[PDB]
Structure 1
Amino acid sequence: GTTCYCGKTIGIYWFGTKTCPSNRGYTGSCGYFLGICCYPVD
C-alpha cells in the first residue's frame, strides 16, 4: 500500500486506474501522478 495527499486530506494511491473502486468505502478522490488518489487511506 502507498499513500496519497489532496487538499490536506490523505488517502490511498491506486495505480493504473482513473476512478476509485466503489466497494472500498472511499468518500472522495483526485487524479494523481501515474494514477489516482482515493480517500480516506486504508
Structure 2
Amino acid sequence: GTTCYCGKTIGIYWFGTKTCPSNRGYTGSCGYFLGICCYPVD
C-alpha cells in the first residue's frame, strides 16, 4: 500500500507529484523516493 509513516504520523505516499493535494487537509510532507509522503492521511 501507499502508506508511509513519518515518525509516528500516518501519511500517504503520492507517487507522481511533489505537491500535496491541498483539497484534503495535510499538515506535513516527507520527501520520499520519487514521491511525497503527505500526512496525516485525511
TM-score tier (shorter)? 0.7 to 0.9
Q: Which runs of 5+ in 1 are unaligned?
A: none
| 2:36 paired with 1:36 | yes
State the identity %.
100
Give the superposition deviation at 1:17.
Answer: 0.8
Give the superposition deviation at 1:7.
Answer: 2.4
Structure 1 stretch 4-13 or stretch 15-24: which is displaced more? 4-13
TM-score, with length taken from structure 1 = 0.76
Number of equivalent positions: 42
RMSD: 1.5
- Pick the structure with more helix per residue: 1
Q: Which runs of 5+ in 2 are unaligned?
A: none
TM-score, with length taken from structure 2 = 0.76
- Runs of 4+ residues deviating >3 angstroms: none
